[PDB]
Amino acid sequence: SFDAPQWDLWQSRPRSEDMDEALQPFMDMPKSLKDRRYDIPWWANPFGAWYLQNILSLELLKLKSKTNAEKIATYRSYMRSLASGKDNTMSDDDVIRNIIKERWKTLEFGDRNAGYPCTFGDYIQFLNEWFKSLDEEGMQRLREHFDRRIRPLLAVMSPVDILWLEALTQNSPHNKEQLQRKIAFQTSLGTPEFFDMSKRLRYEINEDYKVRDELGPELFALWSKAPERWPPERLSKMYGLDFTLVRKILVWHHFKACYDACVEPDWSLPKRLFALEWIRDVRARKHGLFYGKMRFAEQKITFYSDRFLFRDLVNRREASYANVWEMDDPYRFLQTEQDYEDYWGDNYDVYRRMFPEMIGRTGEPVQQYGQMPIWAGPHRQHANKSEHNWMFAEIGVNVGHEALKKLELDPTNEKRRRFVIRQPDGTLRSAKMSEMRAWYWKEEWADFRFWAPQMEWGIENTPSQEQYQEHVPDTTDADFRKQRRIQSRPVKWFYESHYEREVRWPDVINAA
Amino acid sequence: EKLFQEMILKKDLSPSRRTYHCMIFMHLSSGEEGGTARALRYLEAMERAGIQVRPSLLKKIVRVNNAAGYKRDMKRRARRIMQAREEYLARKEEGVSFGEGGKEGASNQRADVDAEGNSILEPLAVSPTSTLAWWEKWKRETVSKHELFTEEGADGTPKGETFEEKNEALRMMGITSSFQTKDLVPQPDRQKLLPLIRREEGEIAGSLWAMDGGELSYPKDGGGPQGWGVRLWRERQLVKREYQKVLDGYRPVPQLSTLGNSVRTAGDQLDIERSGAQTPGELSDYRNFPDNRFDGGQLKPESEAAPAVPFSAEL
Amino acid sequence: AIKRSLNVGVVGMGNMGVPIARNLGFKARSAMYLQIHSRALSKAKRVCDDLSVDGATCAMRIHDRYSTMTKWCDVIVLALADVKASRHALLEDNESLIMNARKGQIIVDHTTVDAETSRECAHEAARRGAYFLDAPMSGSPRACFNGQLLLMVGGDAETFQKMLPIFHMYADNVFHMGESGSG
Amino acid sequence: KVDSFHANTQYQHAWPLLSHDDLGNSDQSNNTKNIMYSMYMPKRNKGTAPW
């Protein structure tokens, strides 16, 4: 039965008392003066009362009330009675902006009863308790306002100009006259011809912020509706910004939408937009040592050394992508969204390290084997079940060569390297693809371009059957193929040989 | 190719190396299937006819193929786009999406009840005034990806590369784009002071890329060589190098800033606010030509002044 | 109506709150977003540093104020030392968790308190629309490391059925005593 | 009390995306500014490095 009141800038939300101080002179303030402070509204400060009186009321004059129209009319009459020739015809927002500018110009920090609206310390208290009432988005907007406006002025102005501005803040005649005697204070003030560079610096910073905040949602909409119609390289070409900048804009916009809504962000998105960059750059780093970067993955011969290696590289780059995304043909096997979240989430560093070249899958299907009969019966049926998985691999003369690794793990090879795994429940199954590749030397590269269904097959790549007939494979001259075919077929006929004679169906005497 | 084989067969002219390079790079730049296989045929015709194969040709072949990989990927993705368009037009007439729109599995297995019947923890709903909720509503309520364009582009590519098709697709999605043409593009390659600041010192913004308040690059609060003073001094030195480039005529004259105008002599500020000058060159034209301005002190445009043409240019 | 994980926060890194946070960080595999509150941010940074170095299965997030802990979490779990600290964190502060509770939040208090404190906590949480469970824990921090703690949950029964998969990550004998105040 | 002393003096935060080298190198299209460091390493190693 409690209604939460809506909080905004007009009435601030109440905060705790153990909060840290935002401004530097308040952190070393003694605690007695901290307890001296009273909980007042934001306009009870004299600077806040000034800002509500002459700035915020003029911004409220832009609405459709009648008293706003009367104040707009008397402000137009006032500014025309000042001088008519300078502001002959302008709208109500123009006179509002002009009087807001003129009242921002005439702000000074003196005594409250001497004719000045507020003191310097009241302004510092307003800044401290205004920064204390900010969230993370409020602090982000404060830093963005610092970067857009105050940062070019600080980049251009000299520190003696900062001391002059501080003397203008404190407004003490003794401090101003103590600064005015110094010749190096008066001579080292900046020239307006050098101060005009702050406009171009401010324009460049606001141009980068316009790249981020204005073009960002348009890029995000065009990429999130149809990514196969507008890929990031197409957006990078049609807007001309950059490739990595467009991808960083997309990642920043999704993470900014997730963080501002109290939602855990989709961590798979930097793995999906920077996939090659995730495999290349993202490493685990230890503390007390420096690392390097590999220029190449392998010590190889160049493709410019021969014309045939050059033609092979050009034909492979024809059959390759330039950038691969989540919707392309190598990622077409992810037919269920559960497989999508399993591949792109928390195991992408394992799933990409399975096979170097991108294939139509990630591993190999697992099949199980039959158990040989144990003639002791149920006396020894317990002994195969154990605690752990028992993995057994083959070695020998034919088996265990690193140069023939993709041939010894080929399931279409009749001399395949035999692996077996006994489960703790006694099941004999074959090994997985990573389980088969774990017994060889490490292969720690990846191909993110070549896709084998994109190979050319009609003009130059034409494999002929006459080239395979040049080896002259014959069955009468060599009978190994027929012997392996005899070894493959079942031997059930050997027992019903006496039961040319050809095998027929059993003739029934009951129906005949 | 027609003019090429008419030159070779009919007029028996031996083509030069440049027109062989043109037929190589035309098939390489075209993203259609087999352009590399025909560029290698032109390479073979260069090899067996005595035409010189330069290494610059090979490096340009690799560079042009890697550049036209984008066109190849666009022409490959357009085929899957047309397949999905035909499948969408089929399944919207068969009516399987009408049967799939009814969430009978969500009705039987509710969000608060699991498969067995226990109560599970449901996450709280976000505020509808947030950005993520509006993005999900824009994902659900807008039109499909297959209804944006009926036909594809002129040469093998999907539509949406130009700005007219982009603006039409955004109109179909209910979005009025702020950037209608390429004149309203910020173009960060035109920046000169900002990449110079980003290269030597560092990022002057810092809070441009900040997710939750920790990815900001700002100087430390203690001081010393990492503090704000040395960073602002080095930024002022870089802006001083750029202003020295302005003074020597390598860079254009910057316009009048508010910080520059507020530090000037008050008579110059009065002349600027009565003349409306943006650059100090306009202020110099306002002062050195007092008969050019209007009666309210306003500055006349440049086209309303005509200098005296001397007769000595008629020599 | 966004399909997402559960935001679970642990308030107070003390003698018993740190193994509760470590059990929630280890045994929850991508099923929750973990939030860690402390009065000093360096203590929450140390807890998240040890959880990330030892290897946790969820992402974690530090907090310094109770308002962000209230606006972020779907489930809040308090494991503090004194009844004064729990009464300050739940009722007495201006940004306190029960007084600013959103509609549908669940606040479980593991700190052993008096009867009237839990009564007023459950009453004001039901007035705000949220849910309050009081579940005083019995066991050592080594027993909390092994996942064997005794919990006596008072509050709603459906809320207890919802909170049993979180309770089973750090506590073994979890009983539902009945209404609020029985545990 | 035995856990409060043993802090993380062993690990470090990972490399961000599009990061540079500790020597100043980066993965760009122009590798003239980047250099190799295989000639600074010792010529023979007793054993096998992880790279």
Partner: peptide
Amino acid sequence: LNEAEKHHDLHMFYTLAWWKLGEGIFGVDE
């Protein structure tokens, strides 16, 4: 250990009177 600074020197630059030089910086940009 090491503590990341909350950048309090961002707030000391707002203590200056930027309205005297920029003529209404704290409002909305034109």
